[PDB]
Amino acid sequence: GHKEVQLKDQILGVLDYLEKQQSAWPFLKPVSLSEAPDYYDIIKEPTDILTMRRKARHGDYKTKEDFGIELKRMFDNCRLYNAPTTIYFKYANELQTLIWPKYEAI
Ligand SMILES: Cc1nnc2c3ccccc3c(N[C@@H](C)[C@H](c3ccccc3)N(C)C)nn12
Numbered sequence: 001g002h003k004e005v006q007l008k009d010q011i012l013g014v015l016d017y018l019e020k021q022q023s024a025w026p027f028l029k030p031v032s033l034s035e036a037p038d039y040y041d042i043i044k045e046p047t048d049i050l051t052m053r054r055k056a057r058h059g060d061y062k063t064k065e066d067f068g069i070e071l072k073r074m075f076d077n078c079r080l081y082n083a084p085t086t087i088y089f090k091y092a093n094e095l096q097t098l099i100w101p102k103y104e105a106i
């Protein structure tokens, strides 16, 4: 109970730092089929910042690694789908590089 509360707050603190970065804005909501019709043929376990924040608020992450797996998957999904010239691919790398020390300190 108390260990989950401490972890929840730390995860939200990392998601707070993540969302105030300029490269975070495209990750604030899920991709739609209108803008990327074959996105969900390629990405089987989609995620985004708001989804992870809801999950964190509700107590869904029992451990730091449970959060880490999905955080990393947000970036990995993005680079799997998008070509290297896209802003999405480029921001996923900038944003992941920025957040990783914060995630590691959890
Ligand atoms: C993130 C991400 N990774 N791949 C994609 C993608 C691929 C092809 C076309 C569009 C996207 C994409 N669209 C973003 C701009 C778009 C958006 C709109 C408003 C606020 C936040 C985000 N989507 C996620 C709804 N966001 N996105």
Ligand SMILES: [Cl-]
Residues within 6 Å of the ligand: none
């Ligand atoms: Cl809500």
